Design a protein around this nucleic acid. Structure first.
Ligand SMILES: [Mg+2]
Ligand SMILES: [Mg+2]
Length: 325
DNA sequence: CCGACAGCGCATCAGC
DNA sequence: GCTGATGCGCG
DNA sequence: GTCGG
């Protein structure tokens, strides 16, 4: 964090554009600049220096000059003073409340944590759970807790069917000392790109984790994606652990490597990599990498490892720990 | 200049 | 009921 | 907001 002040500024601007302006490309532009600067191994002395980096243009360079000179940004000072913008930004911190819902709520005079709490009947299911655990979902998860959680999930999955493979991805797989949530990539040989030889593959696993009181709430749930809440058990007389977000993704077994590449991230790494794929004439999703013809995706290319995907787009392989962008 | 910017699962809603 | 659009979320 | 062509 040699350039922590700058990257914080850019992230705050990114969030303003996403939550308030609803200008998603400006949001992505700011997050790309923040990311490229985050990994720059020198303490930035000027906007001109920063503009040399890809993703940092004239506008951001000027803001960097203002920040370096004064230690702040007037544009952000104003955004902070603005009540509507401040309220909208806050409400979007609740899982399930996006830019649209946030603005609608502020319109109806619902703009604080207290307001949400007394207008629970105006929230959908996801939003109600997000509100319920607002504080807990703010907290990071120490890797030590992530390991305990992995143990529980892997063992319980094995108890349902020894043929399941569960893999913890996200920041955890990238080696992070703390994670925002737990991401689990699930496979079973009965579910491939060719056929689904049995139903409820995800359900069975979700049910088992609920049975042992690990999964506590469900935000959303389909045939291949679960989004919910979980909690480590605590010992006698011990304060309870915070509730944690958990995502579970069931991926066709023969598409494991594209799946694990996707779920490992980071999000910015994925966007950079998929963008590069397009430049190289390929399209990548969590299932396949395909060639682009007219500009139409052709058939899935053969993939036997994460590295095969990197090879297709002519990138040297990067270990998970080097994908934290 | 200006087109493009990654890709997709689940929930909700409008329109039929 | 279904379809398509839109919101929100995941990396 | 930034970039490539
Ligand atoms: Mg995560
Ligand atoms: Mg997650």
């Amino acid at each position: 964090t040699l350039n922590g002040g700058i990257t914080d500024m850019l992230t705050e601007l990114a969030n303003f554009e996403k939550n308030v302006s609803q200008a998603i490309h400006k949001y992505n532009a700011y997050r790309k600049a923040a990311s490229v600067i985050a990994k720059y191994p020198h303490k930035i002395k000027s906007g001109a220096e920063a503009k040399k980096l890809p993703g940092v243009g004239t506008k951001i360079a000027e803001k960097i000059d203002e920040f370096l000179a004064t230690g702040k940004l007037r544009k952000l000072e104003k955004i902070r003073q603005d009540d509507t913008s401040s309220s909208i930004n806050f409400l979007t911190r609740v899982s399930g409340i996006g830019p649209s819902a946030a603005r609608k709520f502020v319109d109806e005079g619902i703009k604080t944590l207290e307001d949400l709490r007394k207008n629970e009947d105006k929230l959908n299911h996801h939003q109600r759970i997000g509100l319920k655990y607002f504080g807990d979902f703010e907290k990071r998860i120490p890797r030590e807790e992530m390991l305990q959680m992995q143990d529980i999930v892997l063992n319980e999955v094995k108890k349902v069917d020894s043929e399941y493979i569960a893999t913890v991805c996200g920041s955890f797989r990238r080696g992070a000392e703390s994670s925002g949530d737990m991401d689990v990539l699930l496979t079973h040989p009965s579910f491939t790109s060719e056929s689904t030889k049995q139903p409820k593959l995800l359900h069975q696993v979700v049910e088992q984790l609920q049975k042992v009181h690990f999964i506590t709430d469900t935000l959303s749930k389909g045939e291949t994606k679960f989004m919910g809440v979980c909690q480590l058990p605590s010992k006698n007389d011990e304060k309870e652990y915070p509730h944690r977000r958990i995502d579970i993704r069931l991926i066709p077994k023969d598409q494991y490597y594209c799946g694990v590449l996707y779920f490992t991230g980071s999000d910015i790494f994925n966007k950079n990599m998929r963008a590069h794929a397009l430049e190289k004439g390929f399209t990548i999703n969590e299932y396949t990498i395909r060639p682009l013809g007219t500009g139409v995706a052709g058939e899935p290319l053969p993939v036997d490892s994460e590295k095969d995907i990197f090879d297709y787009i002519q990138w040297k392989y990067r270990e998970p720990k080097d994908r934290s962008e």
